[PDB]
Structures are given as structure tokens and as C-alpha cells.
From Swiss-Prot:
Gene (UniProt): KPC-2
SUPFAM superfamilies in the cross-refs: beta-lactamase/transpeptidase-like
One GO molecular-function entry: beta-lactamase activity
Keyword Signal set for record: yes
Alphabetical GO biological process terms: beta-lactam antibiotic catabolic process; response to antibiotic
Reactions listed under catalytic activity: a beta-lactam + H2O = a substituted beta-amino acid
This protein's UniProt keywords: Antibiotic resistance, Hydrolase, Plasmid, Signal
This protein's record includes keyword Hydrolase: yes
Miscellaneous comment in the UniProt entry for this protein: Initially two different KPC beta-lactamases were identified from two different Klebsiella (KPC-1 and KPC-2); they were later shown to be identical. The class A beta-lactamase family has a specific amino-acid numbering system, sometimes called Ambler or ABL numbering and often misspelt as Amber. A multiple sequence alignment was used to derive a consensus sequence and then the consensus was numbered taking into account insertions and deletions. This allows use of identical numbers, e.g. for active site residues, despite differences in protein length. UniProt always uses natural numbering of residues, hence there appear to be differences in numbering between this entry and some papers.
Descriptive protein name: Carbapenem-hydrolyzing beta-lactamase KPC-2
Enzyme class: hydrolase
Binding site for a beta-lactam: S47, K50, W82, S107, N109, T212, T214
Reported function: Class A beta-lactamase which confers resistance to the beta-lactam antibiotics, including penicillins, cephalosporins and carbapenems. Acts via hydrolysis of the beta-lactam ring. Has penicillin-, cephalosporin- and carbapenem-hydrolyzing activities.
Length: 269
């Protein structure tokens, strides 16, 4: 409770300057210390649901040994805006594992919808999150409609706290079997879209796995990550933003600054 109080005023100043709302939850898995700022409020998931989507795929692959290497063929109608990987394999298809890595590491939208189909749609991903004890997460729509980020709309949202709690269960806890857990971590470590967010806030020698989200409207963007200080227990954190006007721009610098404040509050230099 006191760590949250240490950074309450700096967080309020950061979000005042940003012109919107910032939600942060961070947990030191070594001490159990946490820092919260609007951590239980709902923010749009945007692209960040794709990390949990890949985790749900891995969970299913624990029972279906052939799932990850199953080839998925798709037509041009499957390609939606921002499919930088899947468009290069339109004429060949890709495996479920390749689609998952593309959804995580490039935010590939065609890949994300194809995987959602394999899981039974937004309700199927929501069901997976319930199965690990997350009662907050909800996915309701497909790409790209899920990015509307409408103020007050609970569709396709979660809270920073629930995002962090579910991330910890999947990457460090027992929600996935050990081989699948390491694959999820490896996919997150290989993300290419987050160099200016949580990654910009940590020392160069720390290992980081993250998944970003960018709705493109309402100043709504986010990032969640597991970070490993060298020789120390990992930290799990989530930073989500939104703003009142549709034309309001998101800020990667604000996300990185919020991550820095969270780590400062936890006392990790
Ligand atoms: C934030 C969203 C959610 S997706 C929705 C939709 N738009 C598209 O699916 C789209 N092109 O559709 C011609 C698109 C999304 S990203 C890109 N490069 N293109 C719609 O027109 O209703 N609208 C918005 C919004 O911007 O307000
Ligand atoms: C950094 C990226 C790459 S672009 C990807 C994508 N988002 C959009 O193309 C988008 N605005 O991007 C400025 C959008 C969607 S609807 C609308 N009106 N705008 C996605 O939704 O996956 N996401 C992220 C990420 O942070 O992972």
C-alpha cells in the first residue's frame, strides 16, 4: 500500500500532461511488492489480446500434439489491414505456431483472426482466460473492429491488474506446462513492436518479453511485459492508456515513463 502512495502524485502528473488516463500495475515477484495506479479500471486491450491468444493456443497444444505444426491455408479475404507476415505467405499458408509468433511479435491481424477461429472466437479466448482465474478479461469482437476504444465501452477490455496477474500465471506460474510456458516466454522475448515502450524503460542488460497494443484512436495504447533484472527475480507489469477524444494521439514516451515510475516505486534501480 505504501509503494503505491510513493508514486501517486508523479503518476497523476504524467497522466495530466498526457491528457488522458494511465493505468499501471507492477509486481515484484521476489518480494511480492506491488504498485497500482488505476490498476482495476478497464482499458481497451487493442493488439495486446494477441499475447493471451497465443497462450491459449499453447494451452490447447498441450493436449493436441500436432496443433502447432498444423498448416493453415487462407485466401486473400483473410488478409485484413496490418498483416505484415501473413501476407508474405498468402500463396503457401503458415503453421499455427508461425501464426502465433506473427500475432505476438508483429501484431499480425490476419494471423490473429485465423487463431481466434481455431479457438472458437472471442468467447473461446475469454473462456481460456476464465480457466486460469481471470474474471476481468473480455474479448468480444474480431480484428479490426475490437480497436474502437469507445469511452465507457467495456467490450474488448481488461484491467492492468488482471493483465499482469494473468501474464504472471502464464509466463512464471503453472497455467501452462513447462515446455509451453517457455515457448510463450520465447515468443514474447522476440517481440519487435515494443522497443519504445516498456523496453525503453529498463537497463540494457535486462531480459524482456512484452506484447504491445495500439488501437489507433482515443489515445489508446498499451504494453505488458515480464522483465528479468540480471541475477534477480522477475517483475511483471502492465501499462495501459486512453484519452477522451477520438483524435487524441497515443504516446509511446508516456508508456515508457509510466513503466519507469512503476519500477522506481517498486525500488528497482
Ligand atoms: C478504431 C476503429 C476500429 S476498426 C473500424 C473499421 N475500419 C476498418 O476496419 C479499417 N478500414 O476499413 C475501411 C481499418 C482499420 S485499421 C486500417 N488501416 N483500416 C470501420 O471502418 O468501421 N473503425 C475504426 C476507426 O478508425 O474509427
Ligand atoms: C505497434 C503496432 C503495429 S500496428 C498494430 C495494429 N494497429 C493499427 O494498425 C492501428 N493503429 O496503429 C497506429 C489501428 C487499428 S484500428 C485503427 N483505427 N488504427 C493492430 O491493431 O494490431 N498494433 C501495434 C501494436 O501496438 O501491437
Amino acid at each position: 500500500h505504501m509503494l503505491t502512495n510513493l508514486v501517486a502524485e508523479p503518476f497523476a502528473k504524467l497522466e495530466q500532461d498526457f491528457g488522458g488516463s494511465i493505468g499501471v500495475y507492477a509486481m515484484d515477484t521476489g518480494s511480492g511488492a506491488t504498485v497500482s495506479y488505476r490498476a482495476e479500471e478497464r482499458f481497451p486491450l487493442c493488439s495486446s489480446f494477441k499475447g493471451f491468444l497465443a497462450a491459449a493456443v499453447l494451452a490447447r497444444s498441450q493436449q493436441q500434439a500436432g496443433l502447432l505444426d498444423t498448416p493453415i491455408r487462407y485466401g486473400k479475404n483473410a488478409l485484413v489491414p496490418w498483416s505484415p507476415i501473413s501476407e508474405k505467405y498468402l500463396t503457401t499458408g503458415m503453421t499455427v505456431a508461425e501464426l502465433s509468433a506473427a500475432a505476438v511479435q508483429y501484431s499480425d491481424n490476419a494471423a490473429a483472426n485465423l487463431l481466434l477461429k481455431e479457438l472458437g472466437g472471442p468467447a473461446g479466448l475469454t473462456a481460456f482466460m476464465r480457466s486460469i482465474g481471470d474474471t476481468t478479461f473480455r474479448l468480444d469482437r474480431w480484428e479490426l473492429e475490437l480497436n474502437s476504444a469507445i469511452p465507457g465501452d467495456a467490450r474488448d477490455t481488461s484491467s492492468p491488474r488482471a493483465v499482469t496477474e494473468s501474464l504472471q500465471k502464464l509466463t512464471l506460474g503453472s497455467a501452462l506446462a513447462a515446455p509451453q510456458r517457455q515457448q510463450f516466454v520465447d515468443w514474447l522475448k522476440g517481440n519487435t513492436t515494443g522497443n519504445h515502450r516498456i523496453r525503453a524503460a529498463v537497463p540494457a542488460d535486462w531480459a524482456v518479453g512484452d506484447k504491445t497494443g495500439t488501437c489507433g484512436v482515443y489515445g489508446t495504447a498499451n504494453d505488458y511485459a515480464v522483465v528479468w533484472p540480471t541475477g534477480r527475480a522477475p517483475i511483471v507489469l502492465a501499462v495501459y492508456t486512453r484519452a477522451p477524444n477520438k483524435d487524441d494521439k497515443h504516446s509511446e514516451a508516456v508508456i515508457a515513463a509510466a513503466a519507469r515510475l512503476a519500477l522506481e516505486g517498486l525500488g528497482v534501480n
